[PDB]
Design a protein around this ligand. Sequence first.
Ligand code: SES
Ligand code: SES
Lengths: 151, 157
Amino acid sequence: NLSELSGPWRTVYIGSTNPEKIQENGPFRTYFRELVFDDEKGTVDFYFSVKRDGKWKNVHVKATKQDDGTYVADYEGQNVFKIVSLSRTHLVAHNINVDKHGQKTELTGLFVKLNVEDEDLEKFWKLTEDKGIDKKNVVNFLENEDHPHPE
Amino acid sequence: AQEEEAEQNLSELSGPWRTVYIGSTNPEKIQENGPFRTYFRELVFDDEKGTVDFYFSVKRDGKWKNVHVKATKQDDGTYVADYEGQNVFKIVSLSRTHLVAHNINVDKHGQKTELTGLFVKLNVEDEDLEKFWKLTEDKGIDKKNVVNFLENEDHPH
Ligand SMILES: CCCCc1nc(N)[se]c1CCC
Ligand SMILES: CCCCc1nc(N)[se]c1CCC
């Protein structure tokens, strides 16, 4: 039951046994946007952004769960990763990437979830109505293309 | 084992904040290039000075701008701030994770705009940080080889 963890997630820290993978232009200097867990298909879709070559790219990768519990996915090689601790607000993970040249890299990561509550959303909506504001004149900043760049 | 909560206070509320929704009686204010299409980065609450400092980014003209605005509390509990005119805003709901607010903006042309906003706080508990560090050490990853993506996002470009 990890479906309820789907939604907007943000990268906090990423560590690597190979600094080149996470320095500027590194393939694993990933800013998470959204995570989607599917308990029936045993899969996880990652939506994130990476500045590769000189520009920003939005990437989508689907990970599949294995009998051992680990997940495997194809991104800058073959990756096999393990969630170490999850909860409503956090995800600490460890990933093993093996690139095109057989180079093995171990990465670690802390990601936090952006939890928007119903109780709070409702309050926002009542207030927006009280001020006679039209739902059309409301901007969603969580799923917006027009956003700033961290680098 | 043991469960513990950090002692709360406006001080504990400071930190990274993100904007979820912003509503406006005047759509020009929050459209692309509008001064109120603001992406929050951090907020600093000061109990003693009765102030709140805002850090956010707005795409003005053709490029992104980081902006800092200090607001001061009033006896009536509202806050005043100077940004793209004069602003008086009231926090209708605040807790460890959310902020719902109502702002009244009078621009340099006498025009009044009323805005509504929902913001969410990005909380990072120490238990999680402590668990991320232990894992990092276990794989023999040296701290110098760790990037803080949160601070990068709070200090963009
Ligand atoms: C362990 C959860 C995140 C794994 C992971 N770390 C990245 N950095 Se991008 C990614 C998915 C694609 C390989
Ligand atoms: C009500 C607190 C947030 C008010 C507020 N909303 C923005 N949008 Se920018 C900002 C600070 C400058 C007036």
